[PDB]
Structure formats: structure tokens, C-alpha cells
């Protein structure tokens, strides 16, 4: 009973450790999956928006510069 | 007196049986002592498979066991 529970909980600990590793790696996969290309696309479209603002900003600069 | 002679003679055959008996017992204990040495190995292996079954049972019960 004593050594029984010892080995049992020891195996539970090892299993739980492997489970933690699995969840951890799952989060790792999620980030490495497509989050980086997603934000790259976001920044790309944002860059396009800056090209949009590149025109009208000139007029505001002109207003400041008379 | 004659009774005593008869008694001493019976006692003599008794004592001879005693010595033969005990000599056989000496051989018995000696044999078992030699055997004993050839048992601890098996005992160790027995307890090894015992605790193997115990621990694997505990772990199977922990995981999705497939018993009755």
C-alpha cells in the first residue's frame, strides 16, 4: 500500500509532466503555426494604409507650411 | 539385575537408532542449506515480477484502464 501509492503517484507525476509538455508544445505550435504570417499580412495591409495616408498628409503639412 | 541387562541392551539399540536418525538429519539440514542458496535468486525474480504487476496495475488504473 505504501510503496504502491508511492509508485502510483510517481507515475501520475511523470504522466502529468508529459501532459504539461504536450500543452506547452501545443501553444508553441499555435504561435509558430500562422500567427507570424498573419501579423505580416496585417502589417502589409497597414503599409498600404500608410500609402493611403501618404497623400492627404501632404496637404496637412502644406497647411502648416502656409 | 536381569531386567537391567535387558534394559541396557534395548537402550543400546535405541542409542544406535538415535545416532543414525540424527546423522540423517544432519544430511537433511546440510542439503537444505545448500538448496537455500539456489532459492534467493528465484525469490528476487518473484518479487520483481510481483512489484511489476503491482506498479503496472496502479498505472493502468491511472490511465484509461481496459479491465472489467
UniProtKB/Swiss-Prot annotation, chain A:
Compartments in which it is found: Chromosome, Centromere, Kinetochore; Cytoplasm, Cytoskeleton, Spindle; Nucleus
Q: Which domain of life, per UniProt?
A: Eukaryota
Q: Which family does it belong to?
A: Belongs to the DASH complex ASK1 family.
Protein function: Component of the DASH complex that connects microtubules with kinetochores and couples microtubule depolymerisation to chromosome movement; it is involved in retrieving kinetochores to the spindle poles before their re-orientation on the spindle in early mitosis and allows microtubule depolymerization to pull chromosomes apart and resist detachment during anaphase.
| Oligomer status and interactors | Component of the DASH complex consisting of ASK1, DAD1, DAD2, DAD3, DAD4, DAM1, DUO1, HSK3, SPC19 and SPC34, with a stoichiometry of one copy of each subunit per complex. Multiple DASH complexes oligomerize to form a ring that encircles spindle microtubules and organizes the rod-like NDC80 complexes of the outer kinetochore. On cytoplasmic microtubules, DASH complexes appear to form patches instead of rings.
Q: Please report the name of this protein according to its UniProt entry.
A: DASH complex subunit ASK1
Amino acid at each position: 500500500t505504501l510503496t504502491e501509492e508511492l509508485e502510483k503517484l510517481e507515475q501520475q507525476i511523470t504522466l502529468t509532466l508529459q501532459e504539461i509538455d504536450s500543452n506547452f508544445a501545443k501553444a508553441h505550435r499555435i504561435v509558430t503555426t500562422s500567427i507570424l504570417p498573419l501579423v505580416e499580412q496585417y502589417g502589409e495591409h497597414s503599409r498600404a494604409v500608410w500609402e493611403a495616408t501618404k497623400f492627404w498628409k501632404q496637404f496637412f503639412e502644406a497647411s502648416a507650411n502656409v | 539385575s536381569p531386567h537391567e541387562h535387558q534394559q541396557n541392551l534395548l537402550l543400546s539399540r535405541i542409542i544406535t537408532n538415535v545416532e543414525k536418525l540424527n546423522e540423517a538429519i544432519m544430511v537433511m539440514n546440510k542439503t537444505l542449506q545448500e538448496i537455500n542458496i539456489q532459492n534467493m535468486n528465484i525469490e528476487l525474480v518473484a518479487q520483481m515480477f510481483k512489484n511489476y504487476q503491482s506498479n503496472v496495475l496502479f498505472h493502468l488504473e491511472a490511465t484509461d484502464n481496459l479491465k472489467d
